[PDB]
RNA sequence: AGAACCUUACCUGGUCUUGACAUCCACGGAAGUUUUCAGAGAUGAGAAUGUGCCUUCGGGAACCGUGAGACAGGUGCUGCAUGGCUGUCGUCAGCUCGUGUUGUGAAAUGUUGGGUUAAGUCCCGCAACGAGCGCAACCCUUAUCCUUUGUUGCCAGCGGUCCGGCCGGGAACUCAAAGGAGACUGCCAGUGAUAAACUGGAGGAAGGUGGGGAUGACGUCAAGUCAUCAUGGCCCUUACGACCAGGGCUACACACGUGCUACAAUGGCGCAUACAAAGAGAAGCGACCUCGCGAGAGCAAGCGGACCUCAUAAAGUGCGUCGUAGUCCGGAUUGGAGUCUGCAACUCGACUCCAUGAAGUCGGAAUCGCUAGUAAUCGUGGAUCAGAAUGCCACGGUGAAUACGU
């Protein structure tokens, strides 16, 4: 099989947000590259905060907040050099942060 | 069970004050505070005077003592006695 | 709130660099078990006097937000209270209520 | 209070006979949630049980559950400047419980090496109706007997009855006065 | 219809994967032996009730590969992973072992620890006065 | 005093958050700060104007603020200049370069804040507000929404107690996690401390403006998605 | 939510007043770095690197030293002076708006009855009529179950072959996150005033809106915060500010609250033996590595966590052993060595381990949560986090009595 140049892997927050915006990023690999796969899911991580929910004293009642944070890997068994400069030209997110560096 | 790991301590807040002394064999109580630090060769037949978090207190230094800390010799904390509480108010 | 929480936390950053950096790997170089018939020589290690404000140690921060001393929080620069209060109207981004 | 009657989870035999009587037993001999621990137990009885009689391994199991039974538990509902007691008689699924506990409350304080040489022992005991938790049903049904002249709040309920168009005997049923 | 027939068997949180053929009546317990894996335990007596009971023992031959939960619980997941399997030998077949009790998935489900209270439900314990 | 707050709860669906970045984690926290200062600064600059809502965003070297205003001239000033001077102070403040958009205006006559600086306003001036609270409520309801809530708090007409009143009218839904209910807690001054005028107003039940994808994996994006099935 | 200093409210000792943090000016130094020495260190002098920035080329900002004010600062007081926000009862099962009629009106009535529910849920209905809030809903999460993806996921079968996805190769397969599917008192039967609804019947993981959560009307309670933070009234601002060191909450005399772990044998002991989930890891952890008595250690490629690590998951499983004697349970104390984070580990820090070894035989008054993945009990991970977890927070193992009656 053919080997994987550079890991292109989007990692956010909002869990229908991650979904949308890979997939237009497979898109935009597919319509400028050869070489695609369909995005792995991957296991989502969940960090667990707790605080009081007054702002003084009243320690039973607390309150619990989750955040979560959703990591979709594409996986290009070959990415072309068109897609690595279309990433680069069109990048304007916040929503998803996009990791290129690889592993 | 706690130690004092690996290093080698002199302490460098001692180093000034105990070379000075030194040469004079003794002189006046040395001024310290830092009391977590440990007593070591160069510091025998000297006088430290140990602050306790309220006042100073002298520690003479001689060879059976340098297994120790100065904040040991010098007390912190108060144990009250235990034959009555006091009572009552006072007019 | 006091201004000492916050003078500290600007006073620690130029200290990091200027005593920690030469100092990074020293305690473990010229006291710890990497000393094996080495160093171990105190005229090399009572120089860690100088890094004692500038220490691993004194990193507990306190919020950035306000300055509020107790029951921090590092992933925020915040604490229960001032969470709370900022996540009332969205402004802490992926912070939800939670279900399960 | 409560609108409606509510019913309970059940129990299902257990996998290495095909028993109720065991599946019952199994949940009163839990120690700190250890079911498994407690099958082991059960189980490990049984054959030294079929050791004494070879007849059925559940012969003398059986049995001490009918003979260690609790039918009635004690009740107090007040009469005025004074409370006294009612009996009133166990469900199924408490008798046979009760029953089941008592008989595990004497075994683990028996001093045996295992907990299954315990346990088959005093149920070769209460299987003969001699042993710890005979005087436990007697006890009670005492209680039960003695106590047959005290009613629930029994000075108000006698003519609450018959005054809310309820019948002329004592009504077991929500919104009158028991 | 399939090769070698396949059952999931997931009970309690463990996944129980069962690999069901014909063959002699031999078992395999995640890489190795019955002896091994629930030596002289009723967890042995467990994976083999469902094989007594549609008579079949000594008929299917067997590949079990087995994650998450507790020993003891493990066999008990094998018993929906042995009866997940078998449906067509008769069309009836997993209605019955429903019917038996020994497809039925634990449908009670977890409640998570909450907050301002010590356990699930366990507000916490004050006598303050 | 019951009730968490009903913005708060909403935050994880169907209502998008009040800022939109992503940090990793370590520099989590110092992104939050700096847009936390960028917004209590910023808002400052534009006192001139009139504004409901503020939306801070940190893509990468860039920070990109969207801006909700009463009409879609007043912070967009003379020949672009107004706006110019607010994105040369926003990368000021801002540990990077900043860019910024104004939204599309939406219902400016009934926005929660809005209306709230109003009824403060005759607080600040200590007249008798002997039909104001009402008169909020009914203006609100004849410009429009199905149902508001005002509750109105400083100590009123200067009394050395505490002293409230609130009026609710038509339909103001509480516990609600989907759609849009606009609230603001306002908080100004007068002469003798702070007052504080609280406005939920209500337009509708469902709102789209945030929702799950239309489709699975398989169908969206590409056509050929299909792997060889092993050959490693 | 992590108290040797710092932190951290306090106290003591040191030190200066526009200020240990910003803006502004007058005068000297670039700030930054490297470095000797005095002083506890704060702090200062001096050496050595650098001359950036802007400039009638004076001088200054940045930042520091020095000095004033405007001002920064203040855990500075008042919670019948407040703003913001939330707790209690309580998922109480109620609360109210518009409007008519009856009363002279305060106020009733409706919000109460009959029938039915988790519910003021809903059928009938009286001068009460119409409607809204809570409750109801959208909502996530999980379960089976269909489905696609196919690695940092997988291997019924087949090949090379020790039968290891390492590779020819496979999608049957969990498996991950997402489209979602199923369950609606809807069908059918009985009951129930036609009725909501409870129960049965059938398939299925499951029938009572599937399990779980989100989820609390309005408000007295003068609840509670001026210490997140807003803020008037209102005080010092050479201070009711702040740096540096040492001490302190966790003191000790006991009582009282809570949780852990125990008092047993359901167990401990020895030798052998098993399968996790979920997440965290740029002050951090970390392969390989060599050192070490297990643990660990220092070094370092490295990491972004379905890759590598924390992590050796524990209770439980196998055999023999033990009987209420503080033991065959419980292991605190304490002596000593090997290891750690730091000027520093004595009182107030961590980890391993050797020897001996007390309290406690399930606790009178007292005292609470709980309806089923619940209570019980065991381990694990995490937020905080130099180094401290019995707490808190989430996760997975094994997992109960009964709910008649008011």
């Known amino acids: 099989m053919q080997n994987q140049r550079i890991r292109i892997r989007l990692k956010a927050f909002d869990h229908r947000l991650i979904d949308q915006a890979t997939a237009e990023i497979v898109e935009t690999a597919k319509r400028t590259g050869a070489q695609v796969r369909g995005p792995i899911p991957l296991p989502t991580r969940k960090e667990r905060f707790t605080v009081l929910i007054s702002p003084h004293v009243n320690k039973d009642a607390r309150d619990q907040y989750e955040i979560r944070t959703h990591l979709r890997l594409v996986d290009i068994v070959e990415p072309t050099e068109k897609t690595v400069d279309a990433l680069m030209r069109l990048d304007l997110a916040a929503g998803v942060d996009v990791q290129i560096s690889l592993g | 069970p706690r130690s004092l790991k690996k290093g080698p301590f002199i302490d460098l807040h001692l180093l000034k004050k105990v070379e000075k002394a030194v040469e004079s064999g003794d002189k006046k109580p040395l001024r310290t505070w830092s009391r977590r630090s440990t007593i070591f060769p160069n510091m025998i037949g000297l006088t430290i005077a140990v602050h306790n978090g309220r006042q100073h207190v002298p520690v003479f230094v001689t060879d059976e003592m340098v297994g120790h800390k100065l904040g040991e010799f010098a007390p912190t904390r108060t144990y009250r006695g235990h034959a009555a509480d006091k009572k009552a108010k006072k007019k | 709130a006091k201004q000492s929480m916050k003078a500290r936390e600007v006073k620690r950053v130029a200290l990091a660099d200027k005593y920690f950096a030469k100092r990074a790997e020293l305690k473990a170089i010229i006291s710890d078990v990497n000393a094996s018939d080495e160093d171990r020589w105190n005229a090399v290690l009572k120089l860690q006097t100088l890094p004692r404000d500038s220490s691993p140690s004194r990193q507990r921060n306190r919020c950035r937000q306000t300055g509020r001393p107790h029951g921090f929080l590092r992933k925020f620069g915040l604490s229960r209270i001032k969470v709370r209060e900022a996540a009332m109207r969205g402004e802490i981004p992926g912070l939800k209520k939670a279900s399960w | 209070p409560r609108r409606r009657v509510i019913g309970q989870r059940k129990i299902l035999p257990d996998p290495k006979f095909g028993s109720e009587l065991l599946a019952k037993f199994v949940n009163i001999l839990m120690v700190d949630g250890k079911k498994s621990t407690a099958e082991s137990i059960v189980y490990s009885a049984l054959e030294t049980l079929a050791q004494r009689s070879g007849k059925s391994e559940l012969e003398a199991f059986e049995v001490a559950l009918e003979n260690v039974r609790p039918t009635v538990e004690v009740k107090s509902r007040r009469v005025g400047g004074s409370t006294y007691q009612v009996p009133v008689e166990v469900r199924p699924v408490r008798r046979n419980a009760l029953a089941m506990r008592w008989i595990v409350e004497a075994a683990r304080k028996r001093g045996d090496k295992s907990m299954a040489l315990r346990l088959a022992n005093e149920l070769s005991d209460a299987a003969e109706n001699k042993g710890t938790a005979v005087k436990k049903r007697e006890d009670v049904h005492r209680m039960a007997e003695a106590n047959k002249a005290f009613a629930h709040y029994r000075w108000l309920s006698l003519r609450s009855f018959s005054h809310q168009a309820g019948a002329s005997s004592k009504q077991p049923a929500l919104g009158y006065l028991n | 219809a399939e090769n070698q027939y396949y059952g999931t068997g997931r009970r309690k949180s463990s996944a129980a994967r069962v690999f069901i053929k014909p063959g002699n009546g031999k078992i395999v317990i995640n890489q190795r032996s019955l002896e091994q894996y629930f030596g002289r335990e009723t967890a042995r007596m467990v994976v083999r009730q469902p094989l007594e009971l549609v008579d079949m023992v000594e008929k299917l031959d067997l590949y079990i590969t087995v994650k998450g939960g507790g020993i003891s619980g493990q066999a008990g997941a094998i018993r929906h992973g042995i009866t997940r399997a078998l449906m067509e030998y008769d069309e009836s077949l997993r209605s019955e072992l429903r019917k038996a009790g020994f497809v039925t998935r634990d449908a009670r489900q977890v409640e998570r620890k909450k907050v301002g209270l010590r356990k699930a439900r366990r507000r916490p314990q004050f006598s303050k006065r | 005093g019951q009730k968490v707050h009903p913005n708060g709860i909403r935050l994880g669906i169907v209502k998008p958050w009040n800022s939109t970045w992503f940090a990793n984690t370590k520099e989590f926290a110092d992104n939050l700060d700096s847009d936390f200062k960028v917004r209590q600064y910023l808002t400052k600059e534009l006192a001139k104007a009139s504004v409901s809502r503020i939306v ?177």
């Open chain 6, 56 to 232: 801070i965003e940190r893509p990468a070297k860039s920070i990109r603020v969207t801006i909700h205003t009463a009409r879609p001239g007043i912070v967009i000033g003379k020949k672009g200049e107004d706006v110019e001077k607010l994105r040369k102070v926003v990368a000021d403040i801002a540990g990077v370069p900043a860019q910024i958009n104004i939204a599309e205006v939406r219902k400016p006559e009934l926005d929660a804040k809005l209306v709230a600086d109003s009824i403060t306003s005759q607080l600040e001036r200590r007249v008798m507000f002997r039909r104001a609270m009402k008169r909020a409520v009914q203006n609100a309801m004849r410009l429009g929404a199905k149902g508001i809530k005002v509750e109105v708090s400083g100590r009123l007409g200067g009394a050395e107690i505490a002293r409230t009143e609130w009026y609710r009218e038509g339909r103001v839904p509480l516990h609600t996690l989907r759609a849009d209910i606009d609230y603001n807690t306002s908080e100004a001054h007068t002469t003798y401390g702070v007052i504080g005028v609280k406005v939920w107003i209500f337009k509708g039940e469902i709102l789209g403006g945030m929702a799950a994808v239309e489709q699975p994996e398989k169908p969206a994006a590409q056509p050929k998605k299909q792997q060889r099935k092993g050959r490693k």
